[PDB]
Design an enzyme around this catalytic site. Structure first.
Site, mmCIF file in Angstrom:
data_model
loop_
_atom_site.group_PDB
_atom_site.id
_atom_site.type_symbol
_atom_site.label_atom_id
_atom_site.label_comp_id
_atom_site.label_asym_id
_atom_site.label_seq_id
_atom_site.Cartn_x
_atom_site.Cartn_y
_atom_site.Cartn_z
ATOM 1 N N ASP A 1 0.754 -1.344 -0.366
ATOM 2 C CA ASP A 1 -0.403 -0.359 0.111
ATOM 3 C C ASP A 1 0.847 1.282 0.093
ATOM 4 O O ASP A 1 1.418 1.537 1.094
ATOM 5 C CB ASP A 1 -0.731 0.033 1.484
ATOM 6 C CG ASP A 1 -2.235 1.263 0.980
ATOM 7 O OD1 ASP A 1 -2.992 0.784 2.178
ATOM 8 O OD2 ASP A 1 -1.946 2.110 0.544
ATOM 9 N N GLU A 2 0.790 1.886 -0.911
ATOM 10 C CA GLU A 2 1.594 2.917 -0.988
ATOM 11 C C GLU A 2 0.890 4.243 0.212
ATOM 12 O O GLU A 2 1.773 4.857 -0.159
ATOM 13 C CB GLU A 2 1.582 3.939 -2.556
ATOM 14 C CG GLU A 2 2.790 5.069 -2.773
ATOM 15 C CD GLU A 2 3.928 3.939 -2.296
ATOM 16 O OE1 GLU A 2 5.012 3.663 -3.625
ATOM 17 O OE2 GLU A 2 4.581 4.896 -1.647
ATOM 18 N N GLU B 1 4.375 -10.892 3.500
ATOM 19 C CA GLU B 1 4.098 -11.310 2.057
ATOM 20 C C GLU B 1 4.567 -12.314 1.236
ATOM 21 O O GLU B 1 3.443 -13.047 0.625
ATOM 22 C CB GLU B 1 3.783 -10.210 1.319
ATOM 23 C CG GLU B 1 3.421 -8.539 1.981
ATOM 24 C CD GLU B 1 1.709 -9.121 2.286
ATOM 25 O OE1 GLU B 1 1.438 -8.446 4.065
ATOM 26 O OE2 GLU B 1 1.272 -9.221 1.582
ATOM 27 N N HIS C 1 -2.412 -17.092 7.717
ATOM 28 C CA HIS C 1 -2.023 -16.374 9.039
ATOM 29 C C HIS C 1 -1.385 -17.194 9.688
ATOM 30 O O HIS C 1 -2.261 -18.539 10.315
ATOM 31 C CB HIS C 1 -2.571 -15.714 9.285
ATOM 32 C CG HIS C 1 -2.292 -14.525 8.558
ATOM 33 N ND1 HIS C 1 -3.284 -13.704 7.781
ATOM 34 C CD2 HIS C 1 -1.172 -13.620 8.129
ATOM 35 C CE1 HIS C 1 -3.235 -12.914 7.318
ATOM 36 N NE2 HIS C 1 -2.235 -12.669 7.114
#
Ligand code: 37A
Ligand code: CA
Ligand code: CA
Ligand code: CA
Ligand code: ZN
Ligand code: ZN
Length: 158
Positions: A93-94, A114, A123
């Site tokens: 996410d930028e 990631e 997870h």
């Protein structure tokens, strides 16, 4: 679930966050791959052009995969399990501020998590695991996978 059925895996950095020096993005991502190749038979190579197994993308908000980002905070990144096309790809996410250190969100630590997903991990409920859902900064220079992470990845590879 799905795993890569081959040992030589390629990645490509689609675009670069303006949050960091280019060489630091390259190094953070390289080191994050190395974490996993340390404990599997996998080999990772960065390619400059063409179709990679794992495409690394920085993007904000809606970015073409139906899994929109949410601005600063919250979802930091996401990645797809092994497969064709978008399979394997990792999106950051930028709207986060990516760094090499304890400030903002550490790219290396996030990328380790990631890439775990890109290789087929889900997870973990263990708070000590890199695959735990919650981001928390730990010193990157001495970082190590938890026993749970190693058991998980070695159940999939090697
Ligand atoms: O992107 C994430 N996580 C990816 C992630 C997880 C864990 C690490 C991690 C960092 C350092 C050491 C271990 C694990 C890094 C990135 C976020 O964490 C959860 C919950 N969440 C949240 O509460 N944000 O405020 C949204 C999303 O899903
Ligand atoms: Ca976010
Ligand atoms: Ca892919
Ligand atoms: Ca940013
Ligand atoms: Zn995405
Ligand atoms: Zn995750």
């Amino acid at each position: 679930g799905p795993v890569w059925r081959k040992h030589y895996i390629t990645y490509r950095i689609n675009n670069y966050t303006p949050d960091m020096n280019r060489e630091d993005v390259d190094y953070a991502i390289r080191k994050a791959f190395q974490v996993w190749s340390n404990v599997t038979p996998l080999k990772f190579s960065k390619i400059n052009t063409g179709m990679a197994d794992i495409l690394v993308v920085f993007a904000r908000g809606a970015h073409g995969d139906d899994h929109a980002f949410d601005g600063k905070g919250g979802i930091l990144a996401h990645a797809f399990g092994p497969g064709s096309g978008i399979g394997g790809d990792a999106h950051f996410d930028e709207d986060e501020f990516w760094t090499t250190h304890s400030g903002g969100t550490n790219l290396f630590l996030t990328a380790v998590h990631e890439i775990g997903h890109s290789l087929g991990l889900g997870h973990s409920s263990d708070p000590k695991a890199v695959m735990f859902p919650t981001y928390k900064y730990v010193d990157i220079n001495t970082f190590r996978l938890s026993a749970d992470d190693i058991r998980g990845i070695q159940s999939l590879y090697g």
